[PDB]
Structure formats: structure tokens, C-alpha cells
Design goal:
Exonuclease mut-7 homolog (chain B), homodimer, six-stranded mixed sheet, globular, alpha/beta, Nucleotidyltransferase, domain 5, 219 residues, 14% strand
Chain lengths: 219, 218
């Protein structure tokens, strides 16, 4: 029931090299990006990426890994100019899962996420656990002791249900259905809306969200 | 006297990474691109690039190497997506000079050119030499005896004078003057015009320019 507020003309299926570099042109100047990914259903075999979704406040890009035929230089350019930069905040939910799996499925997309350097990648589940401990902190649609998944965080922050009916859809089918593309784009974009809601409530209880952000990106 | 036919909004000063990747978005789908470059004046020192100019029929891009702060992977991306692609024709004039100079000025810009291994880079001076063998071939504004430089080739093909007054201007000064930027953009774009003029002349006398092109590029 939550929906993407961006116009459809600002949701981009990246399925060619020209579209990939047009995306990179936008993203390399952003200061905050959210990311998510969709994977082919597996049947005992190796994992394979279907989509990688990158959202800004103004646009959502969905890289079609199956169709685009990107090469090591292309993935290295995305890692260097977006993910492995300390001056760009990346929002994610439990990023270690996707990032570790990328190392085997898309080895040239070599994202650094480790104890030494977070590469400014923020796990929103860690921010959730951190702010839970402030007795004064209240989500705007607060509920008690929900399971710590993204759908519940969306409800707590935005007051709407996250439609997950396409979460386990057939991400290997081409073309993807419009409902699949909509779910994929919103799964990245809602991370920006979640961060904004938490920021506002930390400010409300007289805490500095930027100070908390820096501490989380260093532990 | 000759001027660029494109309007100013299709002449792009590429002075940042985002503008560089926007340029690559266009160029990686083109089938023909002309290139040229401008170099800092030399006073008994190493050569350094000021501008690299890449022209299509619709747009001219001028990479400001001094200001852009492009990194080795960015130059690798330009080499892979433009210069080292066999399926994109590159037009040039005496490219060995620039390319050999790129090898030390921009070591990560891994471009390679010989007249025997071209990477689909056409030297228009070689095409000029080649068509002289066709007794029926005349340039549209043919002259009997001509020193083989770009300005003279522009006159033979287009009937106009190429203003070279900024050729040896101070390419290290920033900002560059509007007249320098205009000269630099036209110096790449006129290569497209030259190739078109020679192709049409060839088609006029029942020869196949694509057959001649393919022979030159091997």
C-alpha cells in the first residue's frame, strides 16, 4: 500500500551501456544513495543477480544484470565512483548479505564493506537497533516489539504497509512485469524515506543524527 | 572563415566526472567519431595534454584534461568504449603524433595505433594519399599541388579557409578564450565534413567508399 512518490519518468530501467553511463553521470555527484537488489530464484545452483536498484531522492535506477551485458570495467566504474567512496552515503538494509553474495556472482563489482572501512554504507537495521535504546525515541507510527525486518520498519516510519507480494516472484523472467519493477524500485527508494524519518525524530529528542551516523559508520 | 555548423548548446566543455560519463553515454553508441587534441606549450619539458576533442555529427565534446581531474579508470573507460572498439570508426589526421604522445602524458589511456593495426582509426592523410590513384577522382575544390596539412584538406573538400590563428595559442591558460574553444571544437568536427566530402565524391564517380575504407583499415 506504500507507493513510490516519484513520477514514472524518473524510474529508469538500465538495460544498455549508454543507460549505465547516464546513470553513473547522475550518481557520481550524489551525496546520498540507497541500494537494493533482486536475485534469480535458486534450485540448489549458484546465485545469480537479476536487478540492482540505486535510488536518489529524484530518480530510481534499476540495472538489469541479465540483459545489460556489463563487463569488468563497467562494474569497476560503479564500485569506484559510487560504492567505495567515503564521501557518498549509501543506505541499505542488512547489506552484508547482498555484498558477500556479489563477490561470487559479480566478482568485478567489488564493494568494500568491512571492519576497517564501511565505505560509508549504512545498515538501517543497525540504526534501528541503536535508536531503540533511546528511551525518548518514538517512531511516528510507533508499535511495540515488531520483528526487525524492512516491512515493519516501513510501517513504523511511514505508516503504510509494504506490499511484499513480489518479493519472491520470478526475477529471472523477461520482461519483468510492471508490478515487479514497481516493487524493486520502491524497495530501494523507501530506504531514503526511512532514514529521513529517523533523522527527524532524533532531532526531535535533541540528538544530532549526523553525530550518530558517523559513530555507526566506524564500529 | 570556416565555422562550426552546430549551435552552442551542442558544444560541451567536459570539466568534471559527471560530464565525462554523460559524454560516454552518447559516444558509446556512436558509429563514427572524430578526434583531435591540444597540448600545453613545450619549453624543454615533458608534454602535457590540455584538451581532447571528440566530435559526432550532432555534438562536440572538449575534455578539459587540466580541470577535470579524471582518474586512470576514467581514461580506461574512454579507451574501451571509444578508441579500442573495432565497430566504431574514428576519424583523425596524422593520429600517430597524438597517440604516441598520449602514451606518456596519459599512461592509463591505453590507445594503440599503427597504420597496420588501426583499431578502426582512419588517418585522413592516408585516405588523401590513397584516392590520388583514381584518375577520375577530383576533390570538389581540387588544386593540382598541395602541401598535405589539415587546413589545405579543408579547402580542397569544403572550399573554405580554416582559421589556424589559435593553433599555437596558449593552451595552458585557464579559462580558455572563446576563440580557442571554437578552434578546438571545429578542428575535430571538420574531420567529419572532410570524410563526408570524399565519400560523396567517390559515390559520384561510381566507386564504393566503404570498400576503400575497409582496405585502408587493414
Amino acid at each position: 500500500a506504500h507507493t513510490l512518490r516519484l513520477d514514472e519518468s524518473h524510474v529508469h530501467l538500465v538495460d544498455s551501456k549508454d543507460k549505465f553511463y547516464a546513470m553513473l553521470s547522475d550518481l557520481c555527484r550524489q551525496s546520498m544513495i540507497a541500494f537494493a537488489s533482486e536475485w534469480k530464484p535458486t534450485f540448489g545452483g549458484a546465485n545469480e543477480v537479476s536487478l540492482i536498484q540505486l535510488a536518489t531522492w529524484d530518480d530510481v535506477y534499476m540495472i538489469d544484470v541479465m540483459v545489460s551485458q556489463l563487463e569488468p570495467l563497467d562494474w569497476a566504474a560503479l564500485a569506484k565512483n559510487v560504492f567505495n567512496r567515503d564521501d557518498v552515503l549509501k543506505l541499505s538494509f542488512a547489506p552484508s548479505t547482498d555484498i558477500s553474495m556479489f563477490q561470487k556472482a559479480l566478482p568485478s563489482f567489488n564493494v568494500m564493506y568491512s571492519s576497517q572501512s564501511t565505505s560509508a554504507i549504512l545498515d538501517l537495521q543497525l540504526l534501528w537497533r541503536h535508536v531503540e535504546r533511546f528511551d525518548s525515541f518514538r517512531f511516528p507510527y510507533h508499535e511495540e516489539s515488531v520483528n526487525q525486518n524492512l516491512a515493519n520498519l516501513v510501517r513504523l516510519c511511514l505508516g503504510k504497509k509494504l506490499d511484499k507480494s513480489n518479493q519472491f516472484s520470478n526475477w529471472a523472467q523477461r520482461p519483468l512485469r510492471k508490478e515487479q519493477l514497481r516493487y524493486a524500485a520502491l524497495d530501494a527508494f523507501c530506504l531514503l524515506e526511512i532514514y529521513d524519518a529517523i533523522e527527524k525524530q532524533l532531532t526531535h529528542i535533541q540528538l544530532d543524527p549526523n553525530e550518530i551516523l558517523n559513530a555507526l559508520l566506524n564500529d
